Amino acid sequence: GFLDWWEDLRSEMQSITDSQEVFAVLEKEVRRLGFDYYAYCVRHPIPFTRPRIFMFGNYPPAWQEHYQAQNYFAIDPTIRHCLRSGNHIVWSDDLFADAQELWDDARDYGLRHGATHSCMAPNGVMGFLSVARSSPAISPHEREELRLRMRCLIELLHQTLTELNHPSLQSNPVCLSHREREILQWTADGKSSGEIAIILSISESTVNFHHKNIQKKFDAPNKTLAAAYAAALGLI
Amino acid sequence: FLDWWEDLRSEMQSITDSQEVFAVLEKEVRRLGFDYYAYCVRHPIPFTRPRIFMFGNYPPAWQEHYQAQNYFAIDPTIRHCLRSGNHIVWSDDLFADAQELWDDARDYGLRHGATHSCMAPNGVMGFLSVARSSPAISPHEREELRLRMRCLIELLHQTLTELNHPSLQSNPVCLSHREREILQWTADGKSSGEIAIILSISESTVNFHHKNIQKKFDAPNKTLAAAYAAALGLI
Ligand SMILES: O=C(CCCOc1cccc(Br)c1)N[C@H]1CCSC1=O
Ligand SMILES: O=C(CCCOc1cccc(Br)c1)N[C@H]1CCSC1=O
């Protein structure tokens, strides 16, 4: 029973105390769902041009090398920060219309049917979980139950890797003060350094002082990087 | 169980009226063992006064007592924060920094409940609450409640987007394939001049797309454009 599985998986997961044991249980659950291999990809929101991306999975090592050789992560439609209709998408030739060399290479290496689920933590980090198999296509009868079963896996995996303080989830910690924060919302809302100084009734000589410290907490050359990074991290 | 979720999907997909969706929702909140509910949409922008819509069948005395205290500003259950599981059961400790809200809430009979939040990638963060007075939420029904509520708010967000409700919609801003690359570099702290070197363009043309981006966001400077676009998932 789904709930018995959920409960038995939860008690089994909270019992884990190491980072390689969680992927072992995950591998056992992917086969339980009727699939052969999995893939977990964590995508941080910054830097906006080359975002930090971590990838773990038990795909065949031949594909793992081919994939890394072609930089397929740059054009993979299954790990793009998009708006999946249900945070979930079943692989189809339409999904890979703008990436035919990847879909052609994938089915060749035996990954002919699969699906990817995406969760977005409200701290910018997005998570992806893919499952793949060779012979049996995804039957419409098992589609929904697959969609629900994977949403529990990704969320559980996200929560337990967070509780274990995994590095792939730990982002650069930014200590923003309540006054510093309120200025940065005004900056990000388009107000100039002079305009800000009149609402808070402070000096322009001190709104730039706070800016100089916010930029130091983001290692920012300008305010733009600070305001944009803060918005992406949910810090404002 | 599964048979319930499957049967619930048929009722919603058949709905062709917004009020009919809230009606079916209310019937589900009763099935969970709760009297009242409340759904909330929190848009990310503006950063100083975000757009917030509120609906729910709370008692009328509370709704106009809630909105008369500006309680939406100090309510922990609608904070743009990272819940341990997109979920938190109400407790005296949860409302430590908002005691006037919790004391009034218990006085008015909203003594037991839980809130569940979903973060749509459009920057919108939806929240769903359920409340009752008599029976405390016992530890044995918690995890089953966390599951049933996650399904209820996901199907609620979707069903409401497929109906084009102007609570879920945000101001469109179609960004060009290159304007998006420029704003990404700008958002990464690069200057209008440095950007021209990376892409092999003229500073006048970098400063030319900027003028169009800030026009697409109604922005005074580049900082509003970069920050707004980052909040909406556009860069
Ligand atoms: O599963 C995913 C998620 C991103 C790629 O994940 C990978 C790929 C190769 C090695 C490793 Br490790 C992870 N994408 C699919 C698209 C079709 S083939 C494929 O890898
Ligand atoms: O659920 C929430 C916040 C979201 C709903 O807010 C409200 C409150 C009153 C009328 C309406 Br409509 C929405 N807060 C809880 C916790 C304390 S008592 C309460 O209403």
Residue numbers in the entry:
A (entry chain B): 6 to 241
B (entry chain A): 7 to 241
What is the paper's account of this structure, in its own sentences?
The majority of traits controlled by rhl transcription factor RhlR depend on PqsE, a dispensable thioesterase in Pseudomonas Quinolone Signal (PQS) biosynthesis that interferes with RhlR through an enigmatic mechanism likely involving direct interaction of both proteins. Here we show that PqsE and RhlR form a 2:2 protein complex that, together with RhlR agonist N-butanoyl-L-homoserine lactone (C4-HSL), solubilizes RhlR and thereby renders the otherwise insoluble transcription factor active. PqsE is a thioesterase that triggers transcription of the RhlR regulon through a hitherto cryptic mechanism, which we identify here as involving a significant chaperone-like component that enhances the stability of RhlR via protein complex formation. In common with many other gram-negative bacteria, two QS circuits use N-acyl-L-homoserine lactones (HSLs) as autoinducers, namely N-(3-oxododecanoyl)-L-HSL (3-oxo-C12-HSL) and N-butanoyl-L-HSL (C4-HSL), which are produced by autoinducer synthases LasI and RhlI and activate the LuxR-type transcription factors LasR and RhlR, respectively.
